[PDB]
Amino acid sequence: QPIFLNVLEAIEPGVVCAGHDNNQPDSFAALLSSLNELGERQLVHVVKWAKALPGFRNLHVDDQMAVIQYSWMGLMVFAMGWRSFTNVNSRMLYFAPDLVFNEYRMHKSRMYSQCVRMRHLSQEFGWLQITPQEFLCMKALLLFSIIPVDGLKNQKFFDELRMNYIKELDRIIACKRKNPTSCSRRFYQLTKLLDSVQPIARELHQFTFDLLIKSHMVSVDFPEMMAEIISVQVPKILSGKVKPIYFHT
Ligand SMILES: N[C@@H](Cc1cc(I)c(Oc2ccc(O)c(I)c2)c(I)c1)C(=O)O
Ligand SMILES: C[C@]12CCC(=O)C[C@@H]1CC[C@@H]1[C@@H]2CC[C@]2(C)[C@@H](O)CC[C@@H]12
Numbered sequence: 001q002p003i004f005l006n007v008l009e010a011i012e013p014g015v016v017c018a019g020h021d022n023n024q025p026d027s028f029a030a031l032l033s034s035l036n037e038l039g040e041r042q043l044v045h046v047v048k049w050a051k052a053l054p055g056f057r058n059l060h061v062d063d064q065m066a067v068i069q070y071s072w073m074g075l076m077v078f079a080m081g082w083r084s085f086t087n088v089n090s091r092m093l094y095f096a097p098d099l100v101f102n103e104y105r106m107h108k109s110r111m112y113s114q115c116v117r118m119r120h121l122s123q124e125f126g127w128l129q130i131t132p133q134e135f136l137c138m139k140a141l142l143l144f145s146i147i148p149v150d151g152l153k154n155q156k157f158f159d160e161l162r163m164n165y166i167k168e169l170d171r172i173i174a175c176k177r178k179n180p181t182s183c184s185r186r187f188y189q190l191t192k193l194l195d196s197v198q199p200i201a202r203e204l205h206q207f208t209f210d211l212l213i214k215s216h217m218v219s220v221d222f223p224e225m226m227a228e229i230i231s232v233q234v235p236k237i238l239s240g241k242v243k244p245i246y247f248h249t
Pocket of ligand 2: 032035036038039042073076077080094095096204207208211
């Protein structure tokens with residue numbers, strides 16, 4: 001495989017447990033608290049993963065933290081969808097080996113509709129027969145799919161880096177598409193899939209935001225990093241100061 005592909009497959013984070021006590025009844029407080037703890041843990045891996053991405057360190061240090069704090073949601077949801085597809089054939093949401101959501105939990109989580117959309121996204125991997133290489137390249141591009149309206153500290157470098165990752169995706173598609181009427185069609189399908197992630201991410205952004213505000217009333221715990229990011233970064237997205245980068249209108 002090319003060097004780019006070797007790197008993506010090599011830095012891909014391993015299994016991460018949520019530390020949820022399945023010995024406890026499925027309550028809203030317990031379920032969401034574990035989801036937050038999982039988010040905190042995953043965030044650590046995302047940071048290491050990102051800094052290990054080709055050219056990422058070329059971005060200004062401040063922009064490195066910015067893009068991560070804005071796209072972590074989309075990145076995790078996309079990865080979760082892939083796990084769910086690969087582990088339980090998208091039958092359930094495989095957040096973590098110790099935190100698998102079934103119908104009952106989807107309802108109990110008080111975000112059934114959102115879970116439904118994530119399951120659909122999960123199924124898309126199967127319907128479109130997404131390859132492991134395509135998944136990796138798409139997930140990397142998600143790290144560069146949401147920035148502030150006023151641009152980053154160094155938009156030049158970000159725009160160049162994003163472009164290079166979009167090109168890498170093309171090669172992965174053109175490195176097997178022997179059919180002349182499937183190559184271009186494939187890029188269309190993948191870009192559409194990538195876009196369908198943002199709408200889902202925004203719904204979770206609004207949901208987690210509201211949950212944090214009334215977290216003390218519903219007995220839901222938010223880790224240090226999660227609480228800080230959801231109250232400082234997320235609001236910028238919900239207020240329209242930070243918007244996702246769509247391929248299609
Ligand atoms: N295509 C290559 C890997 C390859 C991947 C990427 I993302 C590239 O983007 C940049 C641009 C400016 C930089 O400072 C850095 I660091 C990286 C380049 I240049 C090459 C391979 O497969 O070996
Ligand atoms: C990103 C996580 C945790 C990591 C993952 O696999 C995807 C999943 C999507 C729902 C998120 C959850 C983290 C905690 C959140 C943000 C809850 O507060 C509400 C929505 C939850």
